[PDB]
Scaffold this motif. Structure first.
Motif, PDB file in Angstrom:
ATOM      1  N   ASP A 111       0.837  -1.197   0.000  1.00 44.77           N
ATOM      2  CA  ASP A 111       0.000   0.000   0.000  1.00 44.77           C
ATOM      3  C   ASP A 111       0.873   1.248   0.000  1.00 44.77           C
ATOM      4  O   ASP A 111       1.624   1.494  -0.941  1.00 44.77           O
ATOM      5  CB  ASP A 111      -1.117   0.016   1.063  1.00 44.77           C
ATOM      6  N   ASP A 112       0.800   2.003   1.081  1.00 42.93           N
ATOM      7  CA  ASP A 112       1.477   3.274   1.233  1.00 42.93           C
ATOM      8  C   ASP A 112       2.972   3.152   1.515  1.00 42.93           C
ATOM      9  O   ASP A 112       3.676   4.159   1.457  1.00 42.93           O
ATOM     10  CB  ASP A 112       0.816   4.064   2.373  1.00 42.93           C
ATOM     11  N   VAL A 113       3.454   1.951   1.811  1.00 40.93           N
ATOM     12  CA  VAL A 113       4.860   1.728   2.093  1.00 40.93           C
ATOM     13  C   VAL A 113       5.473   0.893   0.984  1.00 40.93           C
ATOM     14  O   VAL A 113       5.125  -0.273   0.764  1.00 40.93           O
ATOM     15  CB  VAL A 113       5.055   1.053   3.445  1.00 40.93           C
ATOM     16  N   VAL A 114       6.426   1.524   0.320  1.00 42.26           N
ATOM     17  CA  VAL A 114       7.245   0.873  -0.664  1.00 42.26           C
ATOM     18  C   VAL A 114       8.606   0.774  -0.022  1.00 42.26           C
ATOM     19  O   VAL A 114       9.132   1.765   0.486  1.00 42.26           O
ATOM     20  CB  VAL A 114       7.343   1.699  -1.962  1.00 42.26           C
ATOM     21  N   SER A 115       9.203  -0.396  -0.110  1.00 46.98           N
ATOM     22  CA  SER A 115      10.512  -0.611   0.499  1.00 46.98           C
ATOM     23  C   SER A 115      11.352  -1.516  -0.373  1.00 46.98           C
ATOM     24  O   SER A 115      10.825  -2.465  -0.960  1.00 46.98           O
ATOM     25  CB  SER A 115      10.387  -1.052   1.953  1.00 46.98           C
ATOM     26  N   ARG A 116      12.655  -1.245  -0.449  1.00 50.81           N
ATOM     27  CA  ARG A 116      13.568  -2.204  -1.063  1.00 50.81           C
ATOM     28  C   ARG A 116      13.554  -3.556  -0.355  1.00 50.81           C
ATOM     29  O   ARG A 116      13.416  -3.620   0.865  1.00 50.81           O
ATOM     30  CB  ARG A 116      14.986  -1.642  -1.122  1.00 50.81           C
ATOM     31  N   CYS A 117      13.684  -4.624  -1.126  1.00 55.21           N
ATOM     32  CA  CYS A 117      13.654  -5.962  -0.556  1.00 55.21           C
ATOM     33  C   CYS A 117      14.674  -6.805  -1.290  1.00 55.21           C
ATOM     34  O   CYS A 117      15.131  -6.462  -2.389  1.00 55.21           O
ATOM     35  CB  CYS A 117      12.258  -6.578  -0.595  1.00 55.21           C
ATOM     36  N   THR A 118      15.006  -7.938  -0.693  1.00 56.06           N
ATOM     37  CA  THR A 118      15.829  -8.898  -1.408  1.00 56.06           C
ATOM     38  C   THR A 118      15.021  -9.592  -2.488  1.00 56.06           C
ATOM     39  O   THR A 118      13.786  -9.675  -2.445  1.00 56.06           O
ATOM     40  CB  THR A 118      16.427  -9.924  -0.439  1.00 56.06           C
ATOM     41  N   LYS A 119      15.760 -10.132  -3.439  1.00 54.04           N
ATOM     42  CA  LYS A 119      15.195 -11.010  -4.435  1.00 54.04           C
ATOM     43  C   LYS A 119      14.553 -12.257  -3.818  1.00 54.04           C
ATOM     44  O   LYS A 119      13.535 -12.784  -4.273  1.00 54.04           O
ATOM     45  CB  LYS A 119      16.332 -11.349  -5.387  1.00 54.04           C
ATOM     46  N   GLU A 120      15.139 -12.692  -2.715  1.00 63.08           N
ATOM     47  CA  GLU A 120      14.686 -13.866  -2.002  1.00 63.08           C
ATOM     48  C   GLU A 120      13.328 -13.623  -1.355  1.00 63.08           C
ATOM     49  O   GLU A 120      12.435 -14.472  -1.457  1.00 63.08           O
ATOM     50  CB  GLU A 120      15.753 -14.262  -0.973  1.00 63.08           C
ATOM     51  N   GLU A 121      13.138 -12.424  -0.794  1.00 64.39           N
ATOM     52  CA  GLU A 121      11.824 -12.014  -0.294  1.00 64.39           C
ATOM     53  C   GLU A 121      10.767 -11.935  -1.379  1.00 64.39           C
ATOM     54  O   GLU A 121       9.616 -12.322  -1.159  1.00 64.39           O
ATOM     55  CB  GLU A 121      11.878 -10.653   0.375  1.00 64.39           C
ATOM     56  N   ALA A 122      11.170 -11.429  -2.544  1.00 64.04           N
ATOM     57  CA  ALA A 122      10.219 -11.310  -3.632  1.00 64.04           C
ATOM     58  C   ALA A 122       9.824 -12.651  -4.232  1.00 64.04           C
ATOM     59  O   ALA A 122       8.654 -12.861  -4.551  1.00 64.04           O
ATOM     60  CB  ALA A 122      10.810 -10.437  -4.711  1.00 64.04           C
ATOM     61  N   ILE A 123      10.788 -13.553  -4.358  1.00 68.88           N
ATOM     62  CA  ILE A 123      10.595 -14.795  -5.096  1.00 68.88           C
ATOM     63  C   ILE A 123      10.462 -15.975  -4.116  1.00 68.88           C
ATOM     64  O   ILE A 123       9.335 -16.329  -3.742  1.00 68.88           O
ATOM     65  CB  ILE A 123      11.699 -14.940  -6.151  1.00 68.88           C
ATOM     66  N   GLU A 124      11.580 -16.558  -3.660  1.00 67.48           N
ATOM     67  CA  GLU A 124      11.559 -17.737  -2.765  1.00 67.48           C
ATOM     68  C   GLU A 124      10.646 -17.686  -1.542  1.00 67.48           C
ATOM     69  O   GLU A 124       9.945 -18.647  -1.230  1.00 67.48           O
ATOM     70  CB  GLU A 124      12.926 -18.192  -2.256  1.00 67.48           C
TER      71      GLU A 124
END
Ligand SMILES: O=C1CCC(=O)N1Cc1cc2nccc(-c3cc(Cl)cc4c3N(C3CNC3)CCC4)c2s1
Length: 335
Positions: A274-287
């Motif tokens: 929602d209102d919070v966009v944050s950088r993340c690892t690829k591992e958080e996004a995928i695995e």
């Protein structure tokens, strides 16, 4: 906005909408075409094209979280029920058919099918009689079966698998009677932007209920799809890069929706909550979205050959002066 990206106001009743809007917003070629739509005469609350223009405009310019009230209003889904009873691809068809209609007769006509439409053939083949039925279909999205499958590859394998129509499930072949037959699907094309929804729900006949599947289901960063086409092209293999992962956490009557995106196609991901966009690892996004209470239900892939066109740079100069003027007056009206 320290990621460079802005969020949408809290989902509330709107569910997976915010997830889809960021996904479509970062389909840069789509966004650019949406800005070129001639909305000059439209109503500031009932035109879906204009409300989508406004959300995209605000996602591109605002440093504060962007609201969606006029957008929800515009297409008439203003209840938790309206979102709950539909799936994400139906919301996507609502938005994209509204947009493609408005682009008819313009320089951006055909944008929607250019980006999102592919072609398939369904067949039924009788084995003992000379009867075949073929149906060519367009598709804008694919629904993949996941129960029992470990990965996207096995879902595709299952999707194109040939079924035998025999025993109690004989094909009615007309004048030939009940006939033993095969049926299959084959892909003829795959689109630049590939929308895959994962069937996290199904009716199951043994239990007699609609079941949620919370199993682990793995999806690659790079998806090769040449195996599944009826004729591959050597000049353009169907290699796909993961762009987006739409995820649900929790309860099947509410829960929480987020989307993970790597907007530029470069493997640098953010979580859009929602209102919070944050950088993340690829591992958080995928695995970490593979599962097995936090479930990926939609994946977006972009074709490698089309990646730089689909994710072309958009600047503020790419929004027509007419529309900027309109949307600025329509922001002055808010103060
Ligand atoms: O599973 C099926 C059956 C037919 C189909 O297309 N699919 C794929 C999906 C698309 C879709 N689109 C939007 C939200 C979901 C969804 C995902 C999870 Cl993991 C949990 C909950 C969901 N909704 C759904 C909104 N409707 C229920 C709320 C309940 C929790 C889904 S699931």
């Amino acid at each position: 906005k320290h990621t460079g990206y802005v969020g949408l106001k809290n989902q509330g009743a709107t569910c997976y909408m915010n997830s889809l809007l960021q996904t479509l917003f970062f389909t840069n070629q789509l966004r650019k075409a949406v800005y070129m739509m001639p909305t000059e005469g439209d109503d500031s609350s009932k035109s879906v094209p204009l409300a989508l223009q406004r959300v995209f405009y605000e996602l591109q310019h605002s440093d504060k979280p962007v609201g969606t009230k006029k957008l929800t209003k515009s297409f008439g889904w203003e209840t938790l029920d309206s979102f709950m009873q539909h799936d994400v691809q139906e919301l996507c068809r609502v938005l994209l058919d509204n947009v493609e209609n408005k682009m008819k007769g313009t320089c951006v006509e055909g944008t929607i099918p250019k980006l999102f439409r592919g072609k398939m053939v369904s067949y039924i083949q009788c084995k003992e009689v000379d009867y075949r039925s073929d149906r060519r279909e367009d598709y804008y999205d694919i629904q993949l079966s996941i129960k029992g499958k470990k990965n996207i590859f096995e879902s595709f394998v299952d999707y194109v698998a040939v079924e035998q129509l025999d025993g109690d499930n004989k094909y009615d072949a007309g004048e030939h009677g009940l006939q033993e037959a095969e049926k299959g699907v084959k892909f003829l094309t795959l689109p630049p932007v590939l929308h895959l929804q994962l069937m996290r729900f199904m009716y199951d006949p043994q239990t007699d209920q609609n079941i949620k599947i919370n199993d682990r289901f793995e999806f690659p960063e790079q998806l090769p799809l040449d195996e599944f086409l009826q004729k591959t092209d050597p000049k353009d293999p169907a290699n796909y890069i993961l762009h987006a992962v739409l995820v649900h956490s929790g309860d099947n009557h509410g829960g929480h929706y987020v989307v993970y995106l790597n907007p530029k196609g470069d493997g640098k991901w953010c979580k859009f909550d929602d209102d919070v966009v944050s950088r993340c690892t690829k591992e958080e996004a995928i695995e970490h979205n593979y599962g097995g209470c936090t479930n990926a239900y939609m994946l977006v892939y972009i074709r490698e050959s089309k990646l730089s066109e689909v994710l072309q740079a958009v600047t503020d100069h790419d929004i027509p002066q007419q529309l900027v003027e309109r949307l600025q007056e329509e922001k002055r009206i808010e103060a």
